[PDB]
């Protein structure tokens, strides 16, 4: 059960409160489809504040009896230690085991186990152990649940190795495929794509009062992309070039008012004065999510590949940062923000999920071929901090009995009913 005001995620895409949710309601299941609300667990107790351990942190406050959904890596190593005179073939593993708490109960949780045998007995077994562990599960981790207060029962190693997980938003709206079906009756099946990329393109190095946006001259692929896309909607991308010495070539997009600036406002990529990331986009049709994203990177982001692919973007307007930090997660990317010299930074990563988003970019050093096969948008983990808190009211949302019992908080975090 969760504290008053715990923003939630409805199966339609909307964000109601845990308190305001009524019975017969649908909440967002960690798989796209909905979950039916039936009860409305009320009461009081100690409340625990879960907070991502590391300022765009994933946090949520719950009831001390709340089953946090978590994961813990499997693990097995066969070393060789000597117990004062006798050398054993120790086998350490992470496995399901019990430990009693001070309440009374026997809690079912994960523990680090050790099983040592003297050498001479031949590691023939020390091995068979390691091999049984190794082919017992089809995943490389344990999906399990422990109540908020029982986290302290975890022994060091296992605890730091345990994390909660937020889920991508596999759910797709279309407020975007629509906003367009109100001006044309002859606009390409590429409608959404092209408009998302330009829209993205507008958030990076854009300008607010005209569909004009200071683009780079040095990028002779971005140029084509920009142009070829400018016409895709219905606009020639006149500009400067071969007249106007500098690298940041201002570009103007006309209707050869203009449906571009009509989009920047209708859908609100310019909420009152300063630019802005609309939150409806988070739960909108994926490709538009990735495509819009592509634009923004192509605009003022940069891609580095040192310890894996990862793209950084910059913004000043938090009204955008916060916007991106969620449009990002909505897809499955892993994200973090760092504040520099007024200036914000959004680091994104995720392998294929990020590729799907970068194979749509066009800027010289930002493209990247699309995935090599099919790829799923797995839930992403996040280690955290749990702080014991006074007492207060709380409100659960008990789901059915033939369902998973998990639903998504507003911040994509996967909590248990």
């Amino acid at each position: 059960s969760f504290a008053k005001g715990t923003n939630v995620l409805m199966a339609d895409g909307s964000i109601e409160c845990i308190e305001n949710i009524e019975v017969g309601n649908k909440v967002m299941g960690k798989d796209g489809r909905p979950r039916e609300v039936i009860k409305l667990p009320r009461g009081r107790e100690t409340m625990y504040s879960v907070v991502q351990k590391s300022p765009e942190l994933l946090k949520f406050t719950c009831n001390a009896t709340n089953e946090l959904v978590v994961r813990t890596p499997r693990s097995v190593r066969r070393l060789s230690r000597t117990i004062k005179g006798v050398e054993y073939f120790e086998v350490i593993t992470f496995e399901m085991g019990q430990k009693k708490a001070p309440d009374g109960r026997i809690v079912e949780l994960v523990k680090e186990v050790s099983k040592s045998y003297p050498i001479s007995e031949g590691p023939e077994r020390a091995n068979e152990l390691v091999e049984s562990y190794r082919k017992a599960s089809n995943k490389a981790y344990f999906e399990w649940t422990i109540e908020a207060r029982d986290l302290s029962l975890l022994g060091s190693h296992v605890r730091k190795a345990t994390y909660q997980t937020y889920a991508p938003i596999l759910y797709e709206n279309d407020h975007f495929f629509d906003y367009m079906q109100k001006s044309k009756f002859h606009l390409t099946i590429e409608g959404p794509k092209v408009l998302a990329y330009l829209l993205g393109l507008w958030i990076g190095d854009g300008l607010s009062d005209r569909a004009t946006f200071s683009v780079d001259s040095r990028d002779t692929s971005l140029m084509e992309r920009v142009t070829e896309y400018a016409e895709k909607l219905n606009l020639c991308a006149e500009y400067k070039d071969r007249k106007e010495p500098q690298v940041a070539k201002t570009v103007n997009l006309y209707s050869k008012e203009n449906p571009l600036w009509d989009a920047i406002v209708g859908l609100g990529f310019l909420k009152d004065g300063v630019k802005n990331i609309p939150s409806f986009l988070s739960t909108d049709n994926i490709g538009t999510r990735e495509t819009f994203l592509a634009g923004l990177i192509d605009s003022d982001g940069y891609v580095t590949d040192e310890h894996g692919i990862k793209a950084t973007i910059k913004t000043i307007h938090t009204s955008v940062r916060d916007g991106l930090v969620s449009l990002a997660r909505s897809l499955g990317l892993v994200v973090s923000v760092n504040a520099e010299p007024i200036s914000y930074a959004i680091y994104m990563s995720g392998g294929d999920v990020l590729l799907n988003v970068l194979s749509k970019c066009a800027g010289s050093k930002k493209f990247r071929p699309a995935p090599a096969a099919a790829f799923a948008r797995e839930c992403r983990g996040f280690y955290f901090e749990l702080q014991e808190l006074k007492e207060d009211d709380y409100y659960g949302i008990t789901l059915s009995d033939d369902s998973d019992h998990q639903f998504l908080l507003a911040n994509q975090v996967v909590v248990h009913n």
Partner: peptide, 7 residues
Amino acid sequence: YVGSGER
């Protein structure tokens, strides 16, 4: 008695 679900 519960916990956002009850057994």
